Design a protein around this ligand. Structure first.
Ligand SMILES: *[C@@H]1O[C@H](CO)[C@@H](O)[C@H](O)[C@H]1NC(C)=O
Length: 383
């Protein structure tokens, strides 16, 4: 069966109004796995909660670990994993933790104990990114030794073995500099291919967050910066297709056009104006794009890259929608990859709150649940 993971972020609960996302916004069958972003690390490489509100506490009660893991009562196939790292975490602490067998063992033993204590079924490593010969060998050793310790703990306790996964780079230069893929593949249950953030407001070149295929609207040098090329690259380097889980974004990326009359992919811009709820210039959520379309933005379809974009005055947004998710699910099924994962639950229209919503919960993620899982996610309202 297809693997359909979804990232939960434990800070989305702090967004305002309609954007507040809590574990109780989940709906059964939407995902096969929830990856909890994030678990955290002490200076000595032992594991700690990122947020004090992850743990049982006086000001908010059960804690987000228990509230995510309680989802398994009403979604009996669901598994959960605790993810370590992410972009904001940087690399400094990973580089120190991975430096020796001794320092790796401190983290590994602590993380295994920690996920068993808090009810998670796996450990996900999101180091962004190992780079260079030392990191490359140390990352192989970390994943190898983590899997070995998980097999030992499973054999010793008789419990089902913890999963070992990683969110991994999609860019060829980053892949080649940091990942020895033939010596990682045997030790991962699967990898979460971060096949997004290809273009974004860190540069002036306007392009697509997650194009499925290249387009000749962008310079030839970019023709490998797309979901297809990245998924094939990991397979060619030795990762079995069934372990490649294709990354699906529910956010988008946007520019303020330097020239409001030049609106084609490949134009130029600075970062988009900040959006109300995501509060990060150049980033926006699907439930914000749906309102832009209701407020006069024009939707275009890029037939080469099979993704949409919208234009509102001098604002130009690359995003994903039901149609791009459909092209991409067809691709996953046609090419035989292991499934598709979502970053994030909280950027989809998770509560059908868009002013133009017909009531469908998770309009984007429900495409994955349907097309890879055969699962129909309900509409909001009375049943
Ligand atoms: C703005 O873009 C339009 C269409 O591409 C072009 O005709 C025009 O010359 C551009 N203006 C400037 C100042 O670059």
């Amino acid at each position: 069966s297809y693997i359909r993971p979804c990232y939960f972020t434990n800070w989305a609960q702090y967004r305002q109004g309609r954007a507040k996302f809590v574990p109780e916004d989940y709906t059964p069958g939407l995902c096969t796995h929830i990856l909890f972003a994030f678990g955290w690390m002490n200076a000595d490489y032992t594991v700690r909660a990122y947020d004090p509100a992850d743990l049982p506490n006086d000001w908010a009660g059960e804690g987000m670990y228990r509230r995510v893991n309680k989802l398994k009562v009403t979604d009996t196939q669901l598994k959960t994993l605790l993810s370590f790292g992410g972009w904001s975490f940087g690399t400094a602490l990973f580089q120190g933790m991975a430096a020796s067998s001794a320092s790796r063992k401190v983290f590994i033993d602590s993380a295994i104990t920690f996920v068993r204590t808090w009810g998670f079924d796996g450990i996900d490593i999101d180091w962004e990114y190992p780079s260079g010969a030392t990191d490359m060998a140390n990352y192989v050793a970390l994943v190898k030794e983590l899997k070995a310790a998980c097999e030992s703990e499973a054999g010793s306790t008789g419990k089902d073995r913890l999963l070992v996964t990683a969110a991994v780079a999609a860019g060829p230069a980053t892949i080649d500099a940091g990942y020895d893929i033939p010596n990682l593949a045997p030790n991962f249950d699967f990898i979460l291919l971060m096949s997004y953030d290809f273009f974004g407001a860190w540069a002036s070149l306007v392009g697509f967050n997650s194009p499925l295929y290249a387009t000749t609207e962008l310079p030839a040098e970019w023709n490998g910066w797309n979901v297809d090329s990245s998924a094939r690259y990991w397979n060619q380097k030795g990762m079995p297709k069934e372990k490649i889980i294709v990354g699906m974004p529910t956010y988008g990326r946007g520019w303020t056009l330097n020239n409001a009359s030049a609106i084609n992919p490949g134009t130029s811009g600075s970062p988009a104006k900040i959006t109300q709820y995501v509060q990060e210039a150049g980033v926006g959520a699907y439930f914000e794009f749906c309102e832009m379309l209701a407020n006069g933005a024009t939707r275009y379809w890029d037939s080469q890259s099979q993704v949409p974009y919208l234009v509102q005055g001098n604002q130009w947004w690359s995003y994903d929608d039901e149609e791009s998710f459909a092209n991409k699910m067809a691709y996953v099924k046609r090419e035989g990859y292991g499934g598709a994962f979502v970053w994030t639950l909280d950027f989809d229209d998770f509560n059908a709150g868009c002013s133009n919503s017909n009531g469908q919960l998770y309009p984007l993620i429900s495409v994955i649940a349907k097309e890879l899982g055969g699962v129909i996610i309900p509409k909001k309202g009375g049943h």
